[PDB]
């Protein structure tokens, strides 16, 4: 169907970024998958973008992506890891900028949920959820989390 097939691109995608890291790759969580499909239909709704509950407690990392069209989950990967131009590795650390690259490529981070919705005006919300959560500010956990290509 178009859910499993969205999901299983959004997850190769991920995982072929995370080899070109030497990372282990992640793997697909059904309630996961669940629980991210429901918040992309709640975005869809209000058609407003924002971090869920889930994110913004720490809980689950969370990586969103927005088109005025249905959106491949190879475009949406894409789109997210290509922040790496901005990230610095001789000086790790997180930036809001780097933010979706740093999540995609989190070495520690296992498993993933994979959600997309669309609004009444066409217009798409891709939600990926992330366990155990990255972008850990603490000193040390970007240079051991996120590696140089």
């Not at 691109?9 to 970024?17: M, R």
């Not at 992640?26 to 509950?53: D, F, V, W």
């Amino acid at each position: 169907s178009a859910s499993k097939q969205f999901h299983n691109e959004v997850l190769k995608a991920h995982n072929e970024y995370r080899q070109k890291h030497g990372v282990p790759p992640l793997k697909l969580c059904k309630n996961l998958n669940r629980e991210a499909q429901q918040y992309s239909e709640a975005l869809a709704s209000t058609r407003i973008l924002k971090h869920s509950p889930e994110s913004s407690r720490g809980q689950c990392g969370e990586n969103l992506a927005w088109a005025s069209y249905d959106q491949t989950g190879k475009e949406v990967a894409d789109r997210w890891y290509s922040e790496i131009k901005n990230y610095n590795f001789q000086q790790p650390g997180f930036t809001s900028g780097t933010g979706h690259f740093t999540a995609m490529v989190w070495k520690n981070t296992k498993k993933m949920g994979v959600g997309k919705a669309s609004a009444s005006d066409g217009s798409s919300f891709v939600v990926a959820r992330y366990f155990p959560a990255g972008n850990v500010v603490n000193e040390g956990f970007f240079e051991e989390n996120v590696l140089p290509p």
